[PDB]
Amino acid sequence: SGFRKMAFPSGKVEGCMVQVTCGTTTLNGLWLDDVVYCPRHVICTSEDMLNPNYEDLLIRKSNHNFLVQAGNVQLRVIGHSMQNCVLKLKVDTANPKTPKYKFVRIQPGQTFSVLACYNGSPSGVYQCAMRPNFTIKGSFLNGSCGSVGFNIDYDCVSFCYMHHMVLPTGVHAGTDLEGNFYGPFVDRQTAQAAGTDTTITVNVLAWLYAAVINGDRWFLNRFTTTLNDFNLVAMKYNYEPLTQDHVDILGPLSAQTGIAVLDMCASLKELLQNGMNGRTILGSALLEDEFTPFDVVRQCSG
Amino acid sequence: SGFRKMAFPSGKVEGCMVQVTCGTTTLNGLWLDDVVYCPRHVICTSEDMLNPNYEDLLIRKSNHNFLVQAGNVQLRVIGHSMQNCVLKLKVDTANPKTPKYKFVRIQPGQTFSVLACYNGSPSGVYQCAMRPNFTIKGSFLNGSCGSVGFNIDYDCVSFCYMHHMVLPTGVHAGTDLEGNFYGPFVDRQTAQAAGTDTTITVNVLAWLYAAVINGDRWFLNRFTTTLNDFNLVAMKYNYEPLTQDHVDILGPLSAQTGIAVLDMCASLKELLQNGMNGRTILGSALLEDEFTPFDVVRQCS
Numbered sequence: 001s002g003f004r005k006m007a008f009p010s011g012k013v014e015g016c017m018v019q020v021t022c023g024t025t026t027l028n029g030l031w032l033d034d035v036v037y038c039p040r041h042v043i044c045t046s047e048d049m050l051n052p053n054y055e056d057l058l059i060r061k062s063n064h065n066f067l068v069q070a071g072n073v074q075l076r077v078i079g080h081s082m083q084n085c086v087l088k089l090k091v092d093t094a095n096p097k098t099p100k101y102k103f104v105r106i107q108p109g110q111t112f113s114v115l116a117c118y119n120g121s122p123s124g125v126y127q128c129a130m131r132p133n134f135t136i137k138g139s140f141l142n143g144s145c146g147s148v149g150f151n152i153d154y155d156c157v158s159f160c161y162m163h164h165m166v167l168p169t170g171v172h173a174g175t176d177l178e179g180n181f182y183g184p185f186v187d188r189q190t191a192q193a194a195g196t197d198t199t200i201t202v203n204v205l206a207w208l209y210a211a212v213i214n215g216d217r218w219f220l221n222r223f224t225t226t227l228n229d230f231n232l233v234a235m236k237y238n239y240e241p242l243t244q245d246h247v248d249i250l251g252p253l254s255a256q257t258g259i260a261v262l263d264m265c266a267s268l269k270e271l272l273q274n275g276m277n278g279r280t281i282l283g284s285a286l287l288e289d290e291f292t293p294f295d296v297v298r299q300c301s302g
Numbered sequence: 303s304g305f306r307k308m309a310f311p312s313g314k315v316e317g318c319m320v321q322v323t324c325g326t327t328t329l330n331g332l333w334l335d336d337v338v339y340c341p342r343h344v345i346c347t348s349e350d351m352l353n354p355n356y357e358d359l360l361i362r363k364s365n366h367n368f369l370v371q372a373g374n375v376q377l378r379v380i381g382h383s384m385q386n387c388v389l390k391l392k393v394d395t396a397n398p399k400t401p402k403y404k405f406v407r408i409q410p411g412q413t414f415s416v417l418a419c420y421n422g423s424p425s426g427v428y429q430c431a432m433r434p435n436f437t438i439k440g441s442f443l444n445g446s447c448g449s450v451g452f453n454i455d456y457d458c459v460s461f462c463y464m465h466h467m468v469l470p471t472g473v474h475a476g477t478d479l480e481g482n483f484y485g486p487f488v489d490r491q492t493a494q495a496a497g498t499d500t501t502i503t504v505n506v507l508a509w510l511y512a513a514v515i516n517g518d519r520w521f522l523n524r525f526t527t528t529l530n531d532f533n534l535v536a537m538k539y540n541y542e543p544l545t546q547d548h549v550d551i552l553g554p555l556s557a558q559t560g561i562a563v564l565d566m567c568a569s570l571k572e573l574l575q576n577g578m579n580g581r582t583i584l585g586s587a588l589l590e591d592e593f594t595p596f597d598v599v600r601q602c603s
């Protein structure tokens with residue numbers, strides 16, 4: 001009963017957050033075993049941030065230039081290296097709270113939980129989606145650099161995102177935990193635009209199924225459509241194309257509600273062409289695209 | 303809008319969640335120090351759930367009838383008592399993960415984080431608001447009974463909600479941690495309708511202040527009002543009247559923006575009487591009512 005943007009419980013990740021400082025530059029790091037992972041931007045002074053040559057900057061650093069604080073306890077740095085845009089500080093102490101974990105690179109349209117942190121201290125948790133243009137529409141303030149995104153399966157934390165920067169439009173850009181940006185961005189303090197964003201079609205369909213499961217059918221209709229004719233209209237409205245794989249992934253929701261995927265597509269086509277006429281769906285005046293089919297299944301199965 | 307529902311980090315509460323079972327009836331409990339708190343509904347068999355006699359059901363129970371588990375580890379029950387609709391099970395082990403904590407009873411409009419739990423295992427976290435009709439629009443499945451809602455202020459967890467039941471409209475009802483229901487609900491498996499809901503005026507005002515902070519201020523008018531005049535008008539539009547405490551919690555936002563609370567009330571009154579005429583506020587044609595003044599200060603600062 002009900003449907004809400006829901007994040008994973010953050011406790012396994014809270015025990016991994018630390019603060020990293022180089023000179024006066026400071027941000028958040030992630031302490032797993034005897035390594036702290038953080039954005040390499042921490043090595044920049046305010047002057048360096050505008051145009052950093054990171055290999056040149058890092059070679060001039062010593063271990064003692066890195067102050068790592070876990071709560072109030074300082075962790076001694078005994079080695080350091082850089083993997084793409086992630087700095088890896090080897091410390092002399094293993095984190096006793098290290099969960100089972102994996103580093104993964106997520107696909108556009110997939111969701112994850114973000115633990116927003118400031119000065120190494122967790123502040124809030126929420127769910128986000130990787131946009132098709134590889135930005136995220138997060139909620140982050142100054143000092144959030146190094147906050148991480150993750151999913152939890154059983155007791156295994158799959159880390160997928162490390163926050164780096166806010167773009168001029170107010171959307172956010174970051175890397176995987178191997179230090180590779182999602183999207184065409186670079187870790188430099190210069191104005192950066194993203195590519196044109198598009199709407200995650202398979203997610204909108206999942207959310208319409210969530211609405212039906214929760215008792216609202218006002219937007220359904222008796223029209224049906226082929227996959228190709230739906231995709232023609234979707235693309236006209238800057239929606240991502242729907243693949244047969246997406247149709248299959250929606251199968252369980254179609255089975256549960258008795259609404260064929262292509263019948264839901266005909267509903268979405270009418271919503272795009274007619275608008276919502278001031279009505280709402282699951283309390284929203286806009287078509288929501290940040291719930292995956294699995295997000296819906298886990299909250300509405302039964 | 304840039305604003306979104308953000309939950310508190312849940313780790314401090316995850317370490318307190320346990321499972322409580324009586325026979326086959328099972329739900330979640332909250333382990334603080336050497337006491338486990340859970341809905342007393344756990345003492346009902348399937349046939350007792352419709353019309354339970356809790357005093358009779360409890361006198362027939364002994365300590366050894368309660369199965370309390372942290373994961374698969376059993377915590378021995380050494381005492382039991384009932385406080386309103388909450389059972390308190392004294393256990394032989396003090397929880398080493400107990401945070402600094404308080405039990406509080408919140409007002410409608412206040413928000414809190416829910417840690418949804420199943421079989422004593424935390425599953426997800428989300429923010430909710432207490433509606434004026436004393437329900438929450440949560441997301442809960444079977445097995446969620448006993449999940450808790452909370453706020454965290456400076457290492458201290460203030461527990462404010464314990465989930466009991468789903469109502470016919472799919473909204474949710476529960477108690478404070480002293481076992482007193484929010485609203486006119488009782489802990490029995492009967493259909494209980496929620497009353498008509500209203501819009502949380504203090505939170506809409508907070509949302510308008512958030513818009514002003516972000517430079518979206520077209521709706522500010524040249525008028526002011528009295529609190530009494532505004533309250534009488536607001537109720538005609540299914541909005542809650544403001545209390546003196548509401549005026550005071552808007553203090554910081556009023557000082558930050560330089561917009562007097564009563565001036566903002568007059569601006570809101572014009573939106574109610576005239577609509578928004580095709581414009582938006584924070585990119586939305588809907589006035590959001592589930593962000594408190596504290597939530598706005600938290601996401602903006």
Ligand SMILES: Cn1cnc(Cn2c(=O)nc(Nc3cc4cn(C)nc4cc3Cl)n(Cc3cc(F)c(F)cc3F)c2=O)n1
Pocket residue numbers: 024025026027039041042140141142143144145163164165166172186187188189190
């Ligand atoms: C509003 N907002 C939303 N997300 C963010 C993230 N973010 C950040 O927290 N900090 C950044 N610059 C820093 C300044 C510092 C000043 N001191 C004393 N220490 C500092 C540390 C940092 Cl990281 N930035 C900007 C930014 C960060 C990068 F990692 C990058 F590659 C380019 C950038 F322009 C930032 O966006 N703020």
Ligand SMILES: Cn1cnc(Cn2c(=O)nc(Nc3cc4cn(C)nc4cc3Cl)n(Cc3cc(F)c(F)cc3F)c2=O)n1
Pocket residue numbers: 001326327328329341343344442443444445446447465466467468474488489490491492
């Ligand atoms: C869909 N949904 C949304 N919220 C809820 C919460 N909820 C719940 O999890 N369980 C309930 N009844 C139980 C049945 C059991 C079967 N076994 C084997 N064990 C059980 C334990 C419980 Cl608690 N209920 C119903 C309910 C629970 C109460 F505490 C109450 F006072 C009245 C009620 F009608 C329930 O709503 N489900």
